[PDB]
Design a protein around this motif. Sequence first.
Motif, PDB file in Angstrom:
ATOM      1  N   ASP A   1     -13.485  -9.194  -1.512  1.00 56.17           N
ATOM      2  CA  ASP A   1     -13.906  -8.366  -2.600  1.00 56.17           C
ATOM      3  C   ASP A   1     -12.793  -8.244  -3.612  1.00 56.17           C
ATOM      4  OD1 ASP A   1     -15.949  -6.327  -3.717  1.00 56.17           O
ATOM      5  OD2 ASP A   1     -14.057  -5.259  -3.686  1.00 56.17           O
ATOM      6  N   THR A   2     -13.001  -8.873  -4.731  1.00 61.35           N
ATOM      7  CA  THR A   2     -12.049  -8.948  -5.799  1.00 61.35           C
ATOM      8  C   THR A   2     -11.718  -7.547  -6.372  1.00 61.35           C
ATOM      9  OG1 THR A   2     -13.034 -11.114  -6.270  1.00 61.35           O
ATOM     10  CG2 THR A   2     -11.573 -10.176  -7.951  1.00 61.35           C
ATOM     11  N   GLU A   3     -12.699  -6.649  -6.363  1.00 61.99           N
ATOM     12  CA  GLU A   3     -12.504  -5.297  -6.888  1.00 61.99           C
ATOM     13  C   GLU A   3     -11.488  -4.548  -6.050  1.00 61.99           C
ATOM     14  OE1 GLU A   3     -16.889  -4.238  -6.883  1.00 61.99           O
ATOM     15  OE2 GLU A   3     -16.325  -3.521  -8.864  1.00 61.99           O
ATOM     16  N   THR A   4     -11.624  -4.663  -4.738  1.00 60.85           N
ATOM     17  CA  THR A   4     -10.713  -4.041  -3.792  1.00 60.85           C
ATOM     18  C   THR A   4      -9.276  -4.528  -4.018  1.00 60.85           C
ATOM     19  OG1 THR A   4     -12.511  -3.815  -2.160  1.00 60.85           O
ATOM     20  CG2 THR A   4     -10.243  -3.684  -1.323  1.00 60.85           C
ATOM     21  N   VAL A   5      -9.151  -5.778  -4.407  1.00 63.70           N
ATOM     22  CA  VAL A   5      -7.863  -6.366  -4.698  1.00 63.70           C
ATOM     23  C   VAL A   5      -7.261  -5.716  -5.929  1.00 63.70           C
ATOM     24  CG1 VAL A   5      -6.624  -8.498  -5.223  1.00 63.70           C
ATOM     25  CG2 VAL A   5      -8.569  -8.501  -3.665  1.00 63.70           C
ATOM     26  N   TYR A   6      -8.043  -5.600  -6.982  1.00 67.35           N
ATOM     27  CA  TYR A   6      -7.568  -4.924  -8.170  1.00 67.35           C
ATOM     28  C   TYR A   6      -7.339  -3.449  -7.922  1.00 67.35           C
ATOM     29  CZ  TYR A   6      -8.028  -9.179 -10.838  1.00 67.35           C
ATOM     30  OH  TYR A   6      -7.887 -10.473 -11.309  1.00 67.35           O
ATOM     31  N   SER A   7      -8.045  -2.900  -6.954  1.00 65.70           N
ATOM     32  CA  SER A   7      -7.847  -1.520  -6.560  1.00 65.70           C
ATOM     33  C   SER A   7      -6.469  -1.356  -5.920  1.00 65.70           C
ATOM     34  CB  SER A   7      -8.940  -1.063  -5.600  1.00 65.70           C
ATOM     35  OG  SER A   7     -10.226  -1.143  -6.201  1.00 65.70           O
ATOM     36  N   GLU A   8      -6.095  -2.280  -5.039  1.00 63.58           N
ATOM     37  CA  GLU A   8      -4.784  -2.221  -4.443  1.00 63.58           C
ATOM     38  C   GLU A   8      -3.697  -2.553  -5.468  1.00 63.58           C
ATOM     39  OE1 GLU A   8      -5.994  -5.055  -1.113  1.00 63.58           O
ATOM     40  OE2 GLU A   8      -3.977  -5.741  -1.549  1.00 63.58           O
ATOM     41  N   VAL A   9      -4.050  -3.379  -6.447  1.00 69.84           N
ATOM     42  CA  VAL A   9      -3.171  -3.664  -7.573  1.00 69.84           C
ATOM     43  C   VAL A   9      -2.982  -2.400  -8.426  1.00 69.84           C
ATOM     44  CG1 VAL A   9      -2.810  -5.044  -9.685  1.00 69.84           C
ATOM     45  CG2 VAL A   9      -3.666  -6.134  -7.633  1.00 69.84           C
ATOM     46  N   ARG A  10      -4.023  -1.580  -8.522  1.00 70.54           N
ATOM     47  CA  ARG A  10      -3.954  -0.316  -9.233  1.00 70.54           C
ATOM     48  C   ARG A  10      -2.864   0.609  -8.681  1.00 70.54           C
ATOM     49  NH1 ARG A  10      -5.642  -0.255 -14.473  1.00 70.54           N
ATOM     50  NH2 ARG A  10      -7.607  -1.430 -14.658  1.00 70.54           N
ATOM     51  N   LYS A  11      -2.553   0.493  -7.399  1.00 71.55           N
ATOM     52  CA  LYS A  11      -1.408   1.219  -6.828  1.00 71.55           C
ATOM     53  C   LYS A  11      -0.072   0.551  -7.168  1.00 71.55           C
ATOM     54  CE  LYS A  11      -4.588   2.049  -4.665  1.00 71.55           C
ATOM     55  NZ  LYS A  11      -6.001   2.235  -5.066  1.00 71.55           N
TER      56      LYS A  11
END
Length: 35
Positions: A5-15
């Motif tokens: 899930d690419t969104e989850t990746v950007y979510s972890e990138v958000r941190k």
Amino acid sequence: LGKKDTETVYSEVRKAVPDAVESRYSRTEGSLDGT
């Protein structure tokens, strides 16, 4: 699991985004390398 899930990746990138800037201020003791 795998993380496809690419969104989850950007979510972890958000941190990681504020992480990088806060290390630039070097508010953290020693820091690691945010540059």
